[PDB]
Every structure is written in structure tokens, then in C-alpha cells.
């Protein structure tokens, strides 16, 4: 920053050198790499002039713009905090308004040039990173100073060709004399009072007379530039004329800094651009006589740095403010600040190319329906959209989803909040993409993964509350028709299952799933899913339950997606479809919000039980799942329940549990209508027990693969479980798993002690047993994770002997895992195969890189074990651990522990043991029966073994 | 945000560490140092098991605190002040 001036001049000269001719390709590559490293390590504050040169040259999009656009994307990706973040970046700070207009006009120019140019593989492949980097860098809520705006050959307007009319030529001459008067007045304010003769204090203009005494022969040559400027002003589409009737010291000062009407100020800025045009024309005529070259002011005025632009705009606005203080009006539009936001301009671009895109999908559908026609009049549009627009909107929405979802009230975005206009416009844009892909999957076959990915991204971050409440009926009807078309599509698939088939198959219905997931995330279901949306989703859930009833191979393999979308709509549905006897007291019901006449004309039979009779009440499905758990049928015996209905329950019950009367209502008037959902914590505890029962009953069945997704679905239902559920079900399940794992580790120890080819075959057999064991743990233990983390404090304070027993069981399981290296490698293999690490991460956030068993035993419940054991026992823990380091077996270390029972710690030995003993006996659940030496040696051996295996894991 | 339990990692000991709390306007906070574990709630829940001694466990007298007085006081200008410098010139025949 100390030497920024000649650092920037060196940057400009290195640009010129890389743009030099008569250079070998290696030499050009060397200079380009120099530019790469130099701009990478140079602060963006002094890179503004180089960026201006880039903004000039790179929109040409020649083959010679490779290094400029590569520099663009590198610098913008590096400084995306310097640009996009409104808060000052801790590394280099905020961006200047000059840089802001630079990147805005850069984005506009690159996009329009890439649009008008024919598709090329290298060009598009390297240009789309640049365009998406600029889009991410530019603050979308940023408003440009002049939205309405116009080597370089700047064309001046026909200043002299357009003859000035006599209706204002007197005013033209008057303002020319007035600019001379303003020169004199600035001198007077500088204390150089203008003197008629040559004046020493008049340094700028020695002789300076009032216009009455000043000779018109030199007045003409002084005033010719202002004459030409005003003739240019009328030569443009503008019309300047006296606002009031009429027509050397102008004491009223002209203030170009003040702000006037937006169109007037923008046309003044365009007049400044015209001043640039004339000045750059004459200066380029002079410069081409000197050998050519580009001057910083000679570059386009819009792309020019905002200081020379500031001076030229100061001149133009001085003219304009003269007009509005002396009574003259200019008439050429009314661009709101919303439209000045780059996000709204980007959305206008997106919708214009969206209607262009629906036009070209129409004609390409026409040419693929008529055999195969490779020739397409809009093939350039096809290639441009597929290679540029789809990833551009992808990355733009990914890195600006926080701002776009931000509402004026719910401001969760880091910067500003999305405008309501742009909000509804992009919601209707998402509806337009839905219509673009509506029964249109054969087209864009190669681009289909990117299409659906951007469809999910656009489905996320849609604040549809603004659209439904105080929003346009056009976009609200667009989204309602999208939902209706999707639902009747599901009806066509269910009737066929008993081309739109390929459309639904290519989809796999994940965009709708993501949409209801987002709606459940932000609780949009109160207003967004209502009336016709509610009815359509209800007949959709009934129809997918009919698919669950049918048992063909296609629906069996489709049941994952069907269950996932069913659970998402259950978490994003407004009324209690389960036990709907109380829907009339529910205020969100279609029948309560609709007149009986409207129900009659919509076909609603005034009964949720009646228009969705396939799915009964939650009481009946609970009796069903309880009977299934009691019978203990195989997973493949009746897979529909666990595939679809159980995820639906594990999504519906946690969401509607707060609404239930068992949960505390927000207020008495709010709870005055009886809640449509009457579930309880006992209800959710019983459903969790049913899940755990079917898991333990299908633990040995190798076809029980979907238990992992069952556990992911049942993570929310684990919360609010009864403490008695531990001894009721968790102890039997964990004990059975521990016994089976003990059998497997015994077999593995036998197979590892015998050395033989059949021994290796048996070791592979126990590898398969270990893999299905890992499946069983990933089905069983994630529930226990949230169980122990939710009820950690209760079992910590009150000494639940059942909890200590289950601690011993999980400790034995950890012992087996630690002494089985085969179990460890099978753990990692199952993790990478089944993507278990994702579920582990999700459970970590909502309580192989890391072991689920390690988290379960070594971290979550080791503390309650350590408080089950005494601190005076913690004074023998290290001795028992060092014996385990000497590798003595459990019985053997128990022998030396019994022999060394007499070296227990004492209170008077150290003050730490004193207060530790004080707290240990001050626990209300403590009893003198723990003083029995056998219990002491048992707990010391167990805790020391757990800690020894843990420290071996920590330090391999 | 990344899911790690520890707030800050790789912290040099340096000079030392002290309990600290900055209250805003109209704010009330109870700075419960570990003078007595009976007053220390949630300690057995998190900290007795993990191996953390309560601060000032054996400290007989109450822990002495220091509060930002917020009263402007005239103090000597630091020589290493990033913006302000004081220079002493003397012995000149005319300049005192």
C-alpha cells in the first residue's frame, strides 16, 4: 500500500506485455503466470485500474481473452468476501463503488457477448467459471448509481449536425455565458475578484470582463464547447426546454453533489458519457498520431474508474443543476431501487432467457417428435443454456440462498433481505422451470442431472409466504398449478402401476421431496400448503399408499422415494390427516377455510376420512405396527409399513406433537379449539418401542438393509422418550447385540489363532458377519445416541442401575470392537459402502472419519461410568490401566486389584480427593453398599479397561 | 458450526488465563466461580466427570475481581502508541 501507485503502473505494463505481439507461446505463458501470481498476492485495493482494463478488454471474448478472464475468476473467487459481504472483510475490507460498478458492467458485458457469440467448447468451458465467479462476487442487493446508462473509438452524437432550434438558442448562449460567469464566481470565492484587464490574482483567466464589456469575438471561442455540449444534449433523444417563461457573478452556487429525479440524473450521466465520447474522440485522434494506445479516460465512461467519471459527472450535473435552478426541464425510465439491485436485473435476464428457453424447448420438442432433425435455428441457445445458464444459476443460488430466502421480517441472510418483487419473480421463475421440465425429460437427456440439481436448489430458498400472503395471484396460481399437475401426475402413475412414465422415472420425485423438506424446515405449511394444495397432496399420499399396498417389483424398488416424499409432505402438511375427527376444530382445514358450496364444486366430501379412506387414523396404524412388532415378521414379509408409513409417522408425530394437548399449548385462547392431533409423549415412546422391537426382531435377517434409513427417519422420534424405555427395550436389544458380538469375536479369535486356508475362509465368513454386525449397530445405536444425550443428566444425578448395566454392556461391546481389528476394517468398509459417515454427521449435528461405537461408548456414556466409579477408585484406575498395559487379562488384573485393595486413596492425602469424596457422598443416590470390596474391584476393572482401550485408540 | 465440541483449539498458554465477562447495557450476570461445588450447578453434568477442577476450589477468601471503571483518567502517553508521539526538545538558544 505504500508503493501502490507504481505497483499499479507495473500491473498495467505487465498487462501490456502479456498483450504484446511477436511473442513465443512460452513467453506469453510466462507473462501470464506472472500476472496470475502477482494479482493473487496483490491486495485488490490497488487492482482497481487493472480490473478496469480487464472490464474494457475481456468482453470482446476473443481467443486472446483467456488470461484476462482467468484472472477475473481467480481474483473474484479469492475476494468474494471483499466484494459480496457488506461487512468489512477482516483481511482486506469492503469494496469500492467503483469496483462495484466495474464488476456489474463486467458481468453484463460478458453475459451478453457470450450470448451473442456461437458456442465453442473451450470458450464456454473456461468462461462459465468466470461468469459464475463474478455473479458470486457481486453483491446482489447492491444498487448501481446509474441503471439507465449507454483503442476505444467513442462516437460523439451529432452535436453540429443537429442544428439547435431558436426556441432555446438564447438559453444555449445564456448558459455558455453562465459557465463563464461560474468560472468568474469560483475565482471570486477563491478571492480572485475578476478584473477587466489582466489581473495578477486571476491566475487561471487573467483578463475577465462581464459579458456586457467582454468582446464577443473571444466570447465565441470561449463558449463554443458549452454550445456544442448543449447542442449534443438536444441531439440525443432528450428534449431540453424552458420550464418557465423567459429567454457576471452567479452568487447562487451550483452543487453537482445534490440528487434530483432518477431519470434526470441518469440522463445527466449519459451526457457525461457524451462528453467522454467527444473528449475521447479528439484524444484518440491525437493518440493515434503518437502511435496508438488506450488512455484511462479514453476507455468507456461506464467502465471508467469512478474518479474520472466523478469529474465528468460533476461537469454534467453542474449543467443539470443550473437547469433546475434557472428553470429548464429535460424529457427523454423511472427505475426503482428494486430494479437497480443487480439481483432483480439478473432475474429480468433470467426470465427473458426463460421465455426464450421455453420457446426453444418447444421447437426442439417439435423437431424430435418429427423423427430426428439435427438442424435447429436455436441450437446456439441450446448450447449456451446448457453450458452456461444452468451452472450459473446453480452456483448463484447456492452461494446466495441465505439472502434470497431472507424476508423483510425474517432477516436470516448475512447481508440484506430479498425484495418481495424479486421473491415472487423468482418463485414464478421456478414454476417456469417446472413447466420447462414438465413431461419433457427426453429432451436435455445429457443435462438432466444438472437440470434436476438446479431444480432442487431453486426449490430451496423460496420464501413462498410472501407469495401466498400479500403476493401476486399470477405466481400463486403458477405454483398452485405446478402442485396440481404434479399431484395428477402421481395419479396417472398410480393408475398405471395398479412419456409421463419416463418423466416420473427420470425425476424419482426428489424435487418435491426437497420442497416439502424446506417447507417443514421453515414451517411454510401453515399458509403455502392450503386449500387445493392440501387436497392434491392428500390424494397424492392416498395414491402412494395404494402403491405401498401393491407389491410389484417396480413399486418395491420405488418405496424408498415414496416413503421419503410421504414423510416430507407429512412434515409439510397443514391439517391432521391422521385421526382427522377433529379437523373441523382445526382452523387450517380445507373444509373450515372453504364454504360448503366451494367444497361441493371442488368435490370435497366434507370428510378427510372419506376422501382419504385408504390411510386410516394414527390409532389404527399404531395398532397395526404394534401387532407387527409383537408378531416379529420379517422385513420382506410386509415392507410397505417400514418403507413408507413408518417414515410418515416419524415425521408427522414429532411435528404435530407440540400441537397436541399433552404438549403445553402456547395460550388458552390458542388451545381453545381442541387440537386435531391428540398424540402424547406416551404415543411417541410406544412408536419408538415398536421401531426398536422390529429392529431387534429383524437384526439377524440379512435382507434388513433399509434399517439405516429407518434410523435416520426415526432420529426425531427418539427425543422425548420415556426413561423406562431404557430397561424396557434398550437393555434387551443392546444385550442381544453384545452376546452376538461376543460370539463373533470368539469365532474370530479362533479363526485368527488357527493358520490355514480354511481358516482364512472362515475369517472371510466372520468378515461378512462383521459387516452385517456394523449394519445392526448403525440400525440400533443412533437411537441410543440421542437417547443418552437427551437423558444424560437424569441418569447422571439419579443413579439408574439399569443405566449402569447398559453401560457395562456397551463397554463389553467396545472391548470386542477394540480387540477385533477385523471389526474395525469392516466398520470402515461398511461406512464407505453405505455412506454411514453422512448419517453419523447428521446425528452429531442433531444429537471412516469417526466411529459410531467410539462416540456411543467412549464419549457419551464414559462420563456416567466414571461417576459410577468412585474417585478413590480413580486412585487405582491408573494402576489397573498400567497392568492392562502389561497385557494382563481381566481376571488376572482383578487378582492384583484384590491384592492391592489396601492402597485406596484417602481424603487427607490431597485436598482434591477431599471435595471429590464430599460430592461423591453428597450425591443423594449414594448408598453404603458400594463400599463392598467386590463391587469396588468390579467397577475399577471395568472403568480401567474402558479407559485403557480408549487411550490405545487415542494414541495408536 | 463444523460440529466440533471444542470452541477454540491450539491455544498457547502464554502468560495465563483468567475468568472474564463483559456485560452490556441493562444486563445481569451471575459469575459463579467454583468457590463451592454445591453452588456450582451442572458441574457434575459437565465438568466433574471430564476432569475439570472448579476454579478457586480451595480458595478460602472470595476471588477478587476487576471491573472497567469507565471513568476518564489522565495517564501517561505510551511510547509505543500507534498514533501519538511525544518528543522532547531542549537546550536551544532561542527555543526553550
UniProtKB/Swiss-Prot annotation, chain A:
Misc remark: Binding of [3H]ryanodine indicates that the heterozygous channel is activated by Ca(2+) concentrations 4-fold lower than normal. Single-cell analysis of cotransfected cells shows a significantly increased resting cytoplasmic Ca(2+) level and a significantly reduced luminal Ca(2+) level.
Post-translational modification: The N-terminus is blocked.
Sequence similarity: Belongs to the ryanodine receptor (TC 1.A.3.1) family. RYR1 subfamily.
Sequence repeat boundaries on the chain: 151-247, 248-346
Name of the protein in question: Ryanodine receptor 1
The protein's role, per its UniProt record: Cytosolic calcium-activated calcium channel that mediates the release of Ca(2+) from the sarcoplasmic reticulum into the cytosol and thereby plays a key role in triggering muscle contraction following depolarization of T-tubules. Repeated very high-level exercise increases the open probability of the channel and leads to Ca(2+) leaking into the cytoplasm. Can also mediate the release of Ca(2+) from intracellular stores in neurons, and may thereby promote prolonged Ca(2+) signaling in the brain. Required for normal embryonic development of muscle fibers and skeletal muscle.
Organism the protein comes from: Oryctolagus cuniculus
Disulfide bridge partners, by residue number: none
Tissue specificity statement from the Swiss-Prot or TrEMBL entry: Detected in skeletal muscle (at protein level). Fast- or slow-twitch skeletal muscle.
Outcome after substituting residue 260 to G: Decreases protein stability
UniProt domain comment: The calcium release channel activity resides in the C-terminal region while the remaining part of the protein constitutes the 'foot' structure spanning the junctional gap between the sarcoplasmic reticulum (SR) and the T-tubule. Pore opening is mediated via the cytoplasmic calcium-binding domains that mediate a small rotation of the channel-forming transmembrane regions that then leads to channel opening.
Cellular location(s): Sarcoplasmic reticulum membrane
Subunit structure: Homotetramer. Can also form heterotetramers with RYR2. Identified in a complex composed of RYR1, PDE4D, PKA, FKBP1A and protein phosphatase 1 (PP1). Repeated very high-level exercise decreases interaction with PDE4D and protein phosphatase 1 (PP1). Interacts with CALM; CALM with bound calcium inhibits the RYR1 channel activity. Interacts with S100A1. Interacts with FKBP1A; this stabilizes the closed conformation of the channel. Interacts with CACNA1S; interaction with CACNA1S is important for activation of the RYR1 channel. Interacts with CACNB1.
